[PDB]
Design a protein around this ligand. Structure first.
Ligand SMILES: [Ca+2]
Ligand SMILES: [Ca+2]
Length: 252
């Protein structure tokens, strides 16, 4: 008889999260999705569930869709395709049993917020993936292979604004002006080469990236050299600040 536990083989993620082992590092106001793949030596998994603790690890049972709120009307969902359970060959290396995760986190959810959930799969004999350890109690995500975490990060951690090299910042005054206006910050700012394109909208309706001059910035510049600070505010309200040089010369 089968006395071998099903085995979590692989996790994949897409969109607004980064995977570190069993932890999903999620940037606010961005959709993400994930898959977790399991195999069993029998080739068949009978039950699969997501639960908030490890207490019911050993009890074979199935969940459909479970979720939790993440502020700003947003949520994370954990989904089992239950109609694929309890079929021969549904959990082989070439056809792993796959559960999905999808959602997003609202801007009002604090940075470093952390949720723990547990995913269990069961073969027909009732052997289960993972174990009964409470990773909160032992302060160690890795102590239970069934544990997964969702950790909230600021969009400012993901993005790196840079200066658009093609836009002129060396100005010459006209014949009869003491100043020249630098105008809008947005014309000078882009994403650093090889880093993610800056967001436009968030998930919360009405959220969007802004490009402004830092409070206290004078924008009508007289002759000389200047350094101005531009503020990129992401949809989640976190910010990068980038210093931008300008030169103002008199007309000959
Ligand atoms: Ca088995
Ligand atoms: Ca940044």
């Amino acid at each position: 008889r089968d006395t071998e536990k099903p085995e979590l083989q692989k996790i994949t993620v897409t969109g607004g999260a980064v995977l570190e082992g069993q932890k999903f590092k999620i940037y606010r106001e961005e959709n993400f999705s994930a898959t977790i793949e399991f195999t069993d030596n029998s080739g068949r998994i009978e039950h699969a569930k997501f639960v908030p603790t490890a207490v019911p690890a050993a009890y074979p049972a199935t969940s459909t869709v479970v979720s939790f709120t993440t502020s700003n009307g947003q949520s994370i969902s954990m989904i089992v395709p239950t109609n694929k359970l309890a079929k021969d060959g549904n959990a082989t290396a070439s056809n792993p049993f796959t559960v999905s995760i999808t959602g997003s986190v609202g801007k009002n959810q604090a940075v470093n917020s952390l949720w723990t959930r547990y995913v269990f799969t069961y073969d027909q004999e009732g052997n289960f993936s993972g174990n009964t350890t409470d990773v909160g109690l032992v302060k160690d995500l890795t102590a239970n292979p069934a544990a997964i975490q969702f950790e909230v990060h600021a969009q400012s951690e993901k993005y790196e604004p840079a200066i658009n090299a093609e836009v002129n910042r060396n100005f010459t005054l006209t014949a009869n002006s003491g100043t020249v206006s630098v105008g809008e910050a947005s014309q000078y700012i882009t994403n650093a080469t090889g880093t993610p394109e800056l967001p436009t909208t968030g998930i919360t309706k009405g959220t969007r990236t802004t490009y402004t001059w830092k409070s206290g910035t004078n924008t009508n510049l007289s002759a000389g050299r200047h350094t101005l600070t531009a503020v990129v505010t992401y949809p989640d309200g976190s910010t990068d600040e980038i210093d931008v040089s300008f030169t103002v010369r008199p007309q000959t």
